[PDB]
Structures are given as C-alpha cells and as structure tokens.
C-alpha cells in the first residue's frame, strides 16, 4: 500500500546542477521525517541529510552543506539541489523516512555518478580454453559502473558466473565472466559473450574457441 | 547567590548575555526558574539558534534571552536497574512553536493522508515516549537535573538585589556611610528626639 | 569519530547450525538497538524497531539484545533466505549516526573440491602492451582458496588481485578469479607461469601450468 | 567602561588619547572546527591596571582549599578559549582591534 519511487538520476558532469524527486504514496512529507543515505561501491551505507519540521537542517561533518532541502506540500514530494560535486560523491542514493532515530521504509533507490574522467569503451579479450572445460571473456579498462555480461544473447545461463568489478591502480574497473562447459561441445557449439553498457554506447561481440599450442 | 558552591562535580556556568561577575550588583525585578531533565549527550542543545530533536520541540530559547543555565550529575538518584518510566518526552509534532509556552495536549499524530481518528494504526504513532535510563550506561547517558534561570531588566520595580551593606557598623567615628543610596560623612550619635516609625 | 568496526568479517554456517554476529560501540550508548539486512540487487530491509520487540513482517526467531557497549545478534532456525550483510545502528540521540563495517554470511557446499583452470593472455591484449594471467577457481568451499602464483618456479607477491562473487541461489557456490597484471616487457622475460590451489577438499595442492610460446 | 574585558583584561584611562580600529576577520581568522588559538581571561584576584598584560597561569582560588596548580573544588581555570566560527553571528565573529 506504501511504495517510494525515485527519478532523475543518471550520468552528470562534476559541478553540475540537478534536482531529485521523491513522492510519498499515502504519506504527507510535511509531517514525517525524511532521511538520505548513500552507499558507494566497496563500502557500506552512510547517512547524507535529514529534514526537521522547518527552517533547520543538519548535514554531515565532512561535507560543507552542499545539499539544500526544499519541500512543497502541494505536490507531496521533496527536492534536493546538487552543488560542488567531487569524485567521492559517486554513490547510490536511497530515499528514506525515519522516526525516533529509527528507519523503517526505504525506496528502491536512484543512482548519481560523478565522472571526473571521461567515459571509455570496454576492452574485450577472449579466454581460450586450453586442452569439462572452462572458458570466458575478460573485460578490462572500462569506466564507469555497471556492465552486464550475457552469453549467446541470454541463451546460455547455466554455469555463468559474473565476477564483481575491481578497482585497478590506474583508476579503471576490471571484470571477468566465465562459464563451465563440458569438453564434448567445444568443437560443435560456438560461444559468444556480449559486452555492452549504455555509458559508452559500444557493442562488442567476441568469439571464444580453443586453439593449439598457446 | 553566595551558596553557589555546594557540589564537587558542579558544572561550569556558560551564562548567556550576563557575566557572572556582575550578577550581585545588578538587580532583577523578576526571576523565572524552569527545571526539566535533559540527557547528558545534548547538554549543549540549550542555546539560541541551535536546533535539534528537543530544542525546537520542547523548549526554545529566544535570541534576546538573558540569564543562565546550570546542570549537575544525578545518576544515582533517577536511575534504576529495572528502568524508569515516569519521565515522558514529546517527539512528533507539526511544527515549532513560540518560545516560553507549555504544551499539554497529547493528541494522535497525523502523518499519512488517511486520518487515523485516534486509532493507533499505520501512519500514526504515539508521539510521547519515555526516558529509558540504566545505571550501566556510558558517560553520555546520565540523567542530568537542569534548571533554566531567566531575568527581566527594566520592566518593574526591583526588589531582588545582592548584599552591598558592608556587614558592619560604626559608632563614635565619622565614616563615609552609604544609607540605601545616599552618601554622607559624619559621626553616628544617639539622638534624644522621638522619631515616628515611617 | 564514532569508530565502530564489526567483527568477525565473515562467517560460514548452514541450516541447523549455530551462527552469531557481535557489534560493539566505542562509547556508551543506551538500550536502543537496530539491525538491518542488506542484500545486493535491492534496498535493505529492517529487522527490529525497539531493543527486543520485532517488526510485523520479519520472522519471530531473530534474537538480539544488550545493555552495555557490546551488542549481538543471532538466528534460531536458519533459513537460506537470510544470507545477506548485517549492520548495526544503536542510537546517537541527535542525528542517528552509527554504523559498522558489516558482515556477510555464506552457506556450505559440503566442502567441494575446486575446479582450477588457467587462462593465457590473448594475442589482442599483447599488442596493447599489457599481459594479464587469470587463474580460475570455481565450485569450491570454504574461503580458503590459495592462488599462490609461481612464475619460473619463483614466488610472486603484490601483483595480483582477487575477486569473489556472491553465493548462487541454486547450488550455493563460490567463484574466485585472480588476475596477474604485468607489463609486456616483463611477460616475455619469463617462460613458465603457473598457479597452485590449496584446499580442504584436495589431498594435495593442484597446480595448473602453461608456458609462453611452448606448446 | 565595565565588562568582562574592560575589568580584567584591558582598561582605558580617562585621559587616554588615541584611536580604536576594528575590522572583521571572519573570512581569515575563523576556522570550520573553531579557532582556539586566541584565548581570554575571566578570573582574577583584582582589577587589572590599564596598559598591563596578565600572563600568570596560576589557578584562581575561591575557597580555602589550595588548588595545587590544578582545578577542582572552588578552583577554576581563568583562561578560556574563543568560539570563532564563520557560520555564526556577530558574537562569535572575531574582530581585529588595534589601539
Ligand atoms: C517633645 O518631646 C519630648 C521628648 O522627646 C517631651 O519631653 C516633650 O514634653 C515634648 N513636647 C511637648 C510640648 O509635649
Ligand atoms: C600586583 O601584584 C600584587 C601582588 O604582588 C597584587 O596585590 C596587585 O593586585 C597586583 N596589581 C594589580 C593591578 O592587580
């Protein structure tokens, strides 16, 4: 009966301006307390901002008050203003409400990604199975998150294991995807991996087949 | 105010608008005392401009406020192992109110679009919660008895004044006496005349 | 400066087993306590509201209480759906700012033997000037997966990064892959590149060896 | 004048001749966590003479118990730190006063 939805997220340059929207179904935003929590990849949740009854708001100690809270009771929604984006600001955003220093209902969430570096396409390198068998594809030097890897356009789903993204020393993400296939079908069935993500708008299809020697 | 030193764990003054040096000579025609209990980890919440969970909901301090506030440790008086439930605090309300007022009404809070009509259901909870205190808590969760002191300057005839009368008298000597404001020099000598009481 | 860290980092338990997680606070906080279940792919869900009372839509078997700076949480009758990250948020009385690192729980796979495979770098990647060697480990349990590298029968340290997936919902398996990253000029300097795996399910360590250029 | 500073910190005689200069230093001398480098005195045995600096670190004694160089019962530290912050009002705004 109660569901929270978020919209307006997406790719944005550092220092840009954007307004978030969060409408409460069956609840009045002018009465209850709302909370904002962030969770960057690789670490846990972190509280962002809270709104009081009116004319007062408290922010994080590390930040310098770069979010302003504006609420309109006519539309029963909430607005936030993005200012002074940094590289650390890239995190998932959850619309939350609170009461008595406790949190009960959270929204599905919206994504805000600050990209100091330009978006680059992913480099796909095949992993040829040497003479069951293990084969896969290697995704290297791609940014930002996320990427979805499918085999045979989603036809191959058994044994597929998509490894989580890791951060290299150069600031670029790396990802690997493998699938376990019996060796009797190595020469009869052709296996292709789909590497594509909308930030780069690059569609790469790679064929993995065994070969002699190296 | 000379009985101000009674407790070893006595907390500092942190007076707002009136220095503690000049409280004795200055006279206040009316003194208002407001006492209520505050937890130990928001002892700095009582200040003009500063907001929080209790500052704008239970007792708001105006910017043009004169007086002082004081606190002391009382963890061995209002604490028990089972738990104290006599003290209650308000948590949910529509908005902030004017300073210097008392609120008694404890109606059901309205949070959703559909009214609850006094029924404790969804989107409506009891705003009045208790002070859960235990004797095994840390240094930031002790019950502190706090009294708020305020004065009024230039509003009525003043009667409350500190003791400035030199605590001794003179006989058979000319001194610069100060008899309730007037300054004069002369020998205090017994008079045989009869003086009316007024 | 809350300075909270959840210990231990990770535990392994199954249905009918005993498991618990302890979250402590550096400073004294009152009886207020809460616990959250954070699973990937969706927003986390709450567990309890007060110190002991539970939520309406949570299992009644979750147990956790405390009075001092130390708090703990445990499950009575474990279910496969309760395998997610655990977080603690007791109280702050001003803004509710308290949390820890977190702890992830996984379910056993009868101590399965790992499937070790080695992936030579592709010729396309060698043209770019970077050589990546990946040692694949699959269908294994527990976390004690050694990917100790051996290049020309010599020890290697500080050159590979390991990544572990989440547990599968069908067979409850692990998946680990470590990529050995080196420059092109250092790749042809050596000849033998191998990775050995030590596991409880293997009586002896299993080493997969491939040679650069040599068939 | 009579006040916290006009009695125990800095006095100006009736025959003083000169000028008093003031400027706002909130953009320079303030700190986000508070500037505790500047301190002021609140306790002294007697009134301070004009054009005299008090550098004594002795603990002020109110009762008969000797403070022994530390605070305690009827013993308080005369030195107190300022609350210079840029996000507060005029009262917490530092001012550069040159006499
Ligand atoms: C005036 O007072 C004195 C004592 O103070 C008294 O002896 C005298 O009789 C009084 N005068 C008259 C007229 O009664
Ligand atoms: C100077 O020192 C003496 C003690 O040696 C003290 O009695 C006096 O009050 C001091 N002067 C001032 C102006 O405080």
Numbering used by the authors:
A (entry chain H): 1 to 82, 82A, 82B, 82C, 83 to 128, 135 to 217
B (entry chain B): 365 to 562
C (entry chain L): 1 to 215
D (entry chain C): 414 to 512
What are the paper's exact sentences on this?
SARS-CoV-2 Omicron variants feature highly mutated spike proteins with extraordinary abilities in evading antibodies isolated earlier in the pandemic. Investigation of memory B cells from patients primarily with breakthrough infections with the Delta variant enables isolation of a number of neutralizing antibodies cross-reactive to heterologous variants of concern (VOCs) including Omicron variants (BA.1-BA.4). YB9-258 and YB13-292 demonstrate best cross-neutralization abilities towards VOCs, including the Omicron BA.1 variant. RBD substitutions in Kappa (L452R, E484Q) and Lambda (L452Q, F490S) variants abolish YB13-292 binding. To understand neutralizing activities of cross-neutralizing antibodies identified by our activity assays we determined the cryo-EM structures of the most potent YB9-258 and YB13-292 antibodies in complex with various spikes proteins.
Although we used molar excess of YB9-258 Fab at high spike concentration (3.1 mg/ml, 22 µM protomer) during sample preparation, we only observed Omicron BA.1 spikes bound by 1 or 2 Fabs. Analysis of these structures suggests that interactions between “up”–“down” RBDs likely hinder opening of the third RBD contributing to absence of 3:3 protomer:Fab complex in the cryo-EM sample. We noted that similar interactions between “up”–“down” RBDs were observed when Omicron BA.1 spike bound to ACE2. We find that YB9-258 maintains binding to all the tested variant RBDs and RBDs with single mutations. Consistent with the mutagenesis analysis, YB9-258 is able to bind Omicron BA.1 spike or RBD without significant change in affinity and maintains neutralization of Omicron BA.1 virus. YB13-292 showed reduced binding to recent Omicron BA.4/BA.5 spike with L452R, while binding by YB9-258 is not affected by recent Omicron variants.
